[PDB]
Write a protein that binds this DNA or RNA. Structure first.
Ligand SMILES: [K+]
Ligand SMILES: [K+]
Ligand SMILES: [K+]
Ligand SMILES: [Mg+2]
Ligand SMILES: [Mg+2]
Ligand SMILES: [Mg+2]
Ligand SMILES: [Mg+2]
Ligand SMILES: [Mg+2]
Ligand SMILES: [Mg+2]
Ligand SMILES: [Mg+2]
Ligand SMILES: [Mg+2]
Ligand SMILES: [Mg+2]
Ligand SMILES: [Mg+2]
Ligand SMILES: [Mg+2]
Ligand SMILES: [Mg+2]
Ligand SMILES: [Mg+2]
Ligand SMILES: [Mg+2]
Ligand SMILES: [Mg+2]
Ligand SMILES: [Mg+2]
Ligand SMILES: [Mg+2]
Ligand SMILES: [Mg+2]
Ligand SMILES: [Mg+2]
Ligand SMILES: [Mg+2]
Ligand SMILES: [Mg+2]
Ligand SMILES: [Mg+2]
Ligand SMILES: [Mg+2]
Ligand SMILES: [Mg+2]
Ligand SMILES: [Mg+2]
Ligand SMILES: [Mg+2]
Ligand SMILES: [Mg+2]
Ligand SMILES: [Mg+2]
Ligand SMILES: [Mg+2]
Ligand SMILES: [Mg+2]
Ligand SMILES: [Mg+2]
Ligand SMILES: [Mg+2]
Ligand SMILES: [Mg+2]
Ligand SMILES: [Mg+2]
Ligand SMILES: [Mg+2]
Ligand SMILES: [Mg+2]
Ligand SMILES: [Mg+2]
Ligand SMILES: [Mg+2]
Ligand SMILES: [Mg+2]
Ligand SMILES: [Mg+2]
Ligand SMILES: [Mg+2]
Ligand SMILES: [Mg+2]
Ligand SMILES: [Mg+2]
Ligand SMILES: [Mg+2]
Ligand SMILES: [Mg+2]
Ligand SMILES: [Mg+2]
Ligand SMILES: [Mg+2]
Ligand code: NA
Ligand code: NA
Ligand code: NA
Ligand code: NA
Ligand code: NA
Ligand code: NA
Ligand SMILES: [Zn+2]
Lengths: 97, 68, 158, 109, 197
RNA sequence: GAGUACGACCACACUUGAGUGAAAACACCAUAUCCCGUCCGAUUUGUGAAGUUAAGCACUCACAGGCUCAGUUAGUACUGAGGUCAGUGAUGACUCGGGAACCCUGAGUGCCGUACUCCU
RNA sequence: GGGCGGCAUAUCUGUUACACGACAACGCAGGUGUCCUAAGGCGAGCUCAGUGGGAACAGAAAUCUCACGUAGAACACAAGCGUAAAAGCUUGCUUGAUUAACGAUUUCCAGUACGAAUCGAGACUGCGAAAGCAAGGCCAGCGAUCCUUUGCGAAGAAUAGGAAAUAUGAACAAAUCAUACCAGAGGUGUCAGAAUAAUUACCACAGGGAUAACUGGCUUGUGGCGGCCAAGCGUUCAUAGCGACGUCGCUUUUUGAUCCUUCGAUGUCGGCUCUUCCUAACCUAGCGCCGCAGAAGACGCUAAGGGUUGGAUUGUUCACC
RNA sequence: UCGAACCACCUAGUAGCUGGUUCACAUCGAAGUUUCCCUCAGGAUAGCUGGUGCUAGUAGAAGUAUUGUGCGGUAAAGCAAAUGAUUAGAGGCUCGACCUAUUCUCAAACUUUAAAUGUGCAAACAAACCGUGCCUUAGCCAACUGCAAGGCCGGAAAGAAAAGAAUUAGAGGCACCAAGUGGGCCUUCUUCGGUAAGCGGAGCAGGCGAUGCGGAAUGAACCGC
RNA sequence: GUACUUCUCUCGUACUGAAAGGGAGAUGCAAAAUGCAUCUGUGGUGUGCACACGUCAAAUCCGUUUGAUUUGCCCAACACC
């Protein structure tokens, strides 16, 4: 799926409250922090004898992921997140066919 | 060991043993929640005035009975 | 095998009559639908927006809500040992004014006219008599009813 | 069936019950009336032995802590030396005449 | 044989004797059983029927509720007519939210000490059902009243709390437990507060 | 007795040939400076009135094709209820009720509104 | 039965399905985990598939033109339905595929979720001269808790938490850090969602005739044994003898199908031995018929009283000599 | 005693599996089906059932008719109508093809048409009808005496005639607490797979299971009851 | 064992928000980013025991009582606000 690099869409913030030009960036998850609360609990549980204490998922079935696009306002600098349908090939394209 | 898959053989008899109860009459549970909002808001203002008129009418009846 | 989608098994139910295709006409658009009216839920397969589920096709109910394009209808639906009042949301193109109360309205109007005539001294219409009463019959053509020989040959083809 | 009931949390999964294989972990109070009588009997015997001294030594009045109980008053452990000095009593001599002494309690008011 | 399918579903549970062990309750039942049978009084029939009911089905009434309903009846009542006797088949309880009440004649199975004191101090009087039968044998000029039962915790718990439109309280000793999934939109789903009937 | 504009129902209104057409309309028609649009003023847009009923349009005609309503098909096909009914079966008839379809054939060939105009 | 296979495991269309709705099988015929910044939205213009007549190269088949053309085309897929001044084709502008105050409802259904839907209300927009039309491509195309991760709570204003400043780390403060509330994303396809390789004939237990292996019972396709009709064979001549194409049966001396009985057990192959029964008759007793001269034989009838062997190879039944 | 000895203890180990489970009478009385589940010999969950009742004893009644008004695409029928399949002559333009009108025979996944049996609604007491009636609305409309809505004040009411013009062993509704069941089987008609089966699998409804009695000599299901 | 005592503890009379923290009467007049005044009072409407006014019909042993109904208040409950 080809998606435009810019989108004219309504901005909810009080500064705009109107259709604005948003820059498009695909979402990528951040790195898991070592000192996150769940990660700290997991490491405490894992320490010592007893082997693996939590399930490790193996039976992967999905071949795709839902595309999340982060729209950054030109003036507001705030970001909105939208979800597209699952696809195998997502690219940001300006050249309209 | 295979068994039976599905049937509806006795279900009608069970349903009719206590009977298929009739629907609730239209004058009960006639809530307007989720209906067209502008009409609902307008009706609310009318009902508020009606409540005020009902209060005034009873006050007048009390005074009328007390006087007579 | 058989699947259970929204429009499963509606091949003949959601189809136009022969030589009766086309979108709804102006008469449906100009119809006035009011809260409290009786309507018949008949799906128009040429619209495909606001279209009721196949169960509610051919059912009659009371309108409880009117929106700019839609109508809310209360339909009785038996479930197990009780009857539920289901509020379905459709478009106005799938509802027609019901005539289930036509006879009762005529009966009430006839009574008011009869009462008005009685209170005004006007002569009342004569009362229809029963066709089940005894009477004398004078025939004008009498024929013998019997089984003839030609009747048996008339039912043998080839 | 199970029906609409509270979700049980009875907490009785340990070997609390005495049986053929478990010594159990239980406490009964069948001796409670006897211990009450014995405690009163001991107090009467103690009063006779220490006669004519009062059975219970003198204790001060203190204010219960926390905002929930600050309006209440009760007996404290012992009199502070500051209170004893103000009353004209040496704390070591006071302990010999039936006065409880607490050198830990401060006098903040 | 006679086709009588489902004839037993016509039968209803009708009790003719009290479950109560109170001898004084039994005496009142004997008195009003005779009055209901030998008098043409709807009041006597109802009072006898209510004397047989269980304690849970004899809800208590508050003194403030009695005072309010009598006032509603006192207006639109002729100035030459005496106020009726408030008759309650059940306990009458005091209300600390109503300081000032008028003088009323109240007949009840039982009064709380505060409620009886409040009634007497207001200039009214408390009556037992034997006195009520003596002075109103047919229940003339009486106001039969019933206590409230719909505000009880048992009623508030009745029904499943996880179905759309339900607002019953669950059976849980820990209030903070059972608050996450099925009760908040952010935890899977939230049970719908309203459902059309 | 007709026309035009907007229409409701959407063939009794469609389709194919043929003929007829008062008045006013409608329509072909003339034209390209400007508004506007095309390879093309064909369509469309603008501006016009020299011409024609030749077409559209409207009426009428056809042992016309369809369509509509009836009859016939036929109490037939099928079917609800019943039998310790017939038959080895296949199935069928009977009893108390309900009751089709095509072919075929008879008749018909739009109807009803609002506004303005012609006949006047 | 189980295994192997397949998937009927979540799900869509037609049919089974018996003219409301609903309905089974490892019934029938097919689909789904995708694809599209356009293949979404809107306006305008246009009409498609195919035919017929005609025009340099040009022919069945290139493009031009004119008539007919109820859709016989097309609408990303499987199917049904629907659609013609469109829902199709072309094109001009667009981002209604955004947001959407926990509005209500349908389908599944326990009237719970999830997924798809329907009718709204508010914001900001697009298209259009305008009524209007759009919050994706109508209806299949998808995902809980916990955990991880991202977005929003901009700046400044308030003598005081108010109509309007997110909150907490509980002796109090600042800055970090970690939490919290709301909305998504990473996934469970056994699709209401465990984190999983074999072998056992050395085997064990609880049980099951809910379930296989052996008798019996129902079938009788298959196997076996017959009938009817008469194209042909029989030099000749349908029927001495037999009988294609068809068709109607019987039998339970074969296999199969089924799983009713038995799994707190009905001893499972063959042979030996011994008795009895059946007749669809090999010999023996009679009798018809012949392509019956005789002899030797074919076919058929009544008849089961009597008789029906010795050996080589093979555990064999069977087979062969 | 050995493919993990013996003794004591943890240990009354756990078992959705097998077996057992002690007096009487009386009033009632099932289910083998739905959804979810590593679920298929088990559970939760609705249904069926008992108990407790509550409410003003015909109130919001009905496995049934009648009348009115909706819905349908199965049985039939059709191929001389569309979509598929199919036999053969004839007429037009020695063969053939092509076209035309026919003809023989068909359809669970074909249909112009179209039943029987069905299915939704209505048939006067919180309702509906009448009034140049009244009050309110931040609702519609260019406004309003119009429309939409919530009420108030009056009126009229065969309380539903006549025409075949209903009937009822019709107290309607509302809760609460729970059990057993969640292996079914048979039959009339409909019906799918299979050569078929006392075979497997469904629909509507009866029945057995849970039930004897009187009959068919004998038989859980047949007849009568 | 029975009799006696508890400024406590506990369940309730108040509930909400993740929290910081806030926290529920009616009527009248009037519309003040905490509006004023009063305190004998169901917030309103629809349906609804008894009781109180009447009013019809049936039956009386003529004292009445068996139904229905108008109006008022409506208790408990149920439904819209
Ligand atoms: K149960
Ligand atoms: K203190
Ligand atoms: K955890
Ligand atoms: Mg979205
Ligand atoms: Mg089962
Ligand atoms: Mg069908
Ligand atoms: Mg149809
Ligand atoms: Mg319970
Ligand atoms: Mg309360
Ligand atoms: Mg002229
Ligand atoms: Mg031109
Ligand atoms: Mg002309
Ligand atoms: Mg001419
Ligand atoms: Mg004709
Ligand atoms: Mg049906
Ligand atoms: Mg159906
Ligand atoms: Mg268009
Ligand atoms: Mg909601
Ligand atoms: Mg979709
Ligand atoms: Mg789609
Ligand atoms: Mg959609
Ligand atoms: Mg800020
Ligand atoms: Mg699973
Ligand atoms: Mg899934
Ligand atoms: Mg699952
Ligand atoms: Mg699971
Ligand atoms: Mg070995
Ligand atoms: Mg065992
Ligand atoms: Mg076998
Ligand atoms: Mg055979
Ligand atoms: Mg042969
Ligand atoms: Mg078996
Ligand atoms: Mg065995
Ligand atoms: Mg045995
Ligand atoms: Mg033996
Ligand atoms: Mg023989
Ligand atoms: Mg022999
Ligand atoms: Mg022999
Ligand atoms: Mg034990
Ligand atoms: Mg199990
Ligand atoms: Mg047992
Ligand atoms: Mg019984
Ligand atoms: Mg068992
Ligand atoms: Mg047929
Ligand atoms: Mg036909
Ligand atoms: Mg055909
Ligand atoms: Mg009907
Ligand atoms: Mg009548
Ligand atoms: Mg017998
Ligand atoms: Mg509370
Ligand atoms: Na259960
Ligand atoms: Na909008
Ligand atoms: Na997810
Ligand atoms: Na077997
Ligand atoms: Na012989
Ligand atoms: Na039998
Ligand atoms: Zn912005």
């Amino acid at each position: 799926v080809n998606y435009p690099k810019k989108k004219v869409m309504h901005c909810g913030d009080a500064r705009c409250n109107a259709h604005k030009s948003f820059k498009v960036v695909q979402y990528k998850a951040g790195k898991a922090r070592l000192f996150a609360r769940g990660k700290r609990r997991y490491d405490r549980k894992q320490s010592g004898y007893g082997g693996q204490t939590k399930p490790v998922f193996h039976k992967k079935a999905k071949t795709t992921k839902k595309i999340v696009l982060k729209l950054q306002c030109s003036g507001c600098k705030s970001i909105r997140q939208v979800v597209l349908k699952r696809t195998k090939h997502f690219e940001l394209n300006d050249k309209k066919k | 060991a295979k068994s039976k898959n599905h049937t509806n053989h006795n279900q009608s008899s069970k349903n009719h043993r206590n009977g298929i109860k009739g629907p609730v009459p239209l004058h009960l549970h006639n809530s307007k929640r989720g209906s067209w909002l502008p009409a609902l808001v307008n009706a609310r203002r009318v009902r508020k005035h009606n409540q005020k008129a009902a209060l005034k009418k009873r006050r007048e009846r009390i005074a009328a009975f007390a006087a007579k | 095998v058989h699947s259970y989608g929204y429009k499963s098994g509606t091949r003949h139910l959601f189809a136009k009559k022969f030589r009766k295709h086309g979108v709804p006409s102006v008469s449906t658009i100009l119809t006035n639908i009011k809260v409290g009216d009786y309507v018949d839920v008949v799906a128009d397969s040429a619209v495909r927006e606001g279209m009721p589920h196949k169960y509610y096709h051919g059912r009659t109910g009371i309108v409880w809500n009117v929106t700019p394009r839609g109508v809310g209808v209360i339909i009785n639906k038996p479930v197990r040992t009780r009857t539920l009042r289901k509020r379905i949301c459709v478009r106005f193109e799938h509802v027609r004014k019901s005539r289930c109360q036509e006879a009762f309205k005529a009966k009430e109007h006839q009574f008011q006219a009869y009462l008005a005539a009685k209170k005004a001294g006007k002569a009342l219409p004569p009362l229809q008599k029963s066709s089940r009463l005894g009477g004398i019959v004078r025939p004008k053509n009498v024929e013998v009813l019997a089984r003839r020989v030609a009747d048996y040959e008339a039912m043998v083809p080839y | 069936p199970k029906g609409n009931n509270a979700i049980p949390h009875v907490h009785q999964k340990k070997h609390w019950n005495p049986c053929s294989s478990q010594k159990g972990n239980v406490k009964v109070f069948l001796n409670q009336p006897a211990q009450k009588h014995r405690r009163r009997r001991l107090r009467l015997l103690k009063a006779k032995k220490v006669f004519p001294r009062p059975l219970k030594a003198l204790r001060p009045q203190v204010n219960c802590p926390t905002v929930r109980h600050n309006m209440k008053r009760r007996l404290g452990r012992g009199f502070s030396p500051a209170e004893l000095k103000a009353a004209g009593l040496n704390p070591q001599y006071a302990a010999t005449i039936g006065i409880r002494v607490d050198s830990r309690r401060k006098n903040k008011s | 044989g006679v086709d009588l399918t489902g004839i037993s579903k016509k039968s209803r549970v009708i009790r003719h004797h009290t479950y109560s062990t109170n001898p004084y309750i039994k005496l009142l039942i004997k008195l009003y059983k005779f009055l209901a049978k030998r008098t043409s009084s709807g009041f006597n029939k109802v009072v006898y029927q209510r004397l047989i009911k269980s304690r849970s089905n004899r809800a208590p009434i508050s003194l403030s509720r009695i005072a309010v309903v009598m006032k509603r009846k006192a207006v639109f009542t002729a100035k030459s007519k005496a106020a009726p006797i408030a008759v309650v088949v059940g306990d009458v309880l005091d209300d600390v939210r109503m300081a000032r009440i008028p003088a009323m004649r109240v007949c009840a199975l039982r009064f709380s000490k505060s409620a009886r004191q409040s009634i007497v101090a207001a200039g009214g009087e408390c009556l037992t059902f034997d006195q009520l039968a003596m002075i109103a044998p047919t229940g003339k000029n009486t106001y039969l009243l019933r206590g409230r039962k719909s505000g009880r915790e048992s009623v508030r718990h009745f029904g499943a709390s996880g179905v759309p439109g339900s607002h019953s309280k669950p059976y849980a000793t820990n209030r903070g437990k059972e608050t996450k999934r099925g009760r908040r939109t952010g935890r899977s789903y939230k049970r719908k507060a309203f459902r059309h009937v």
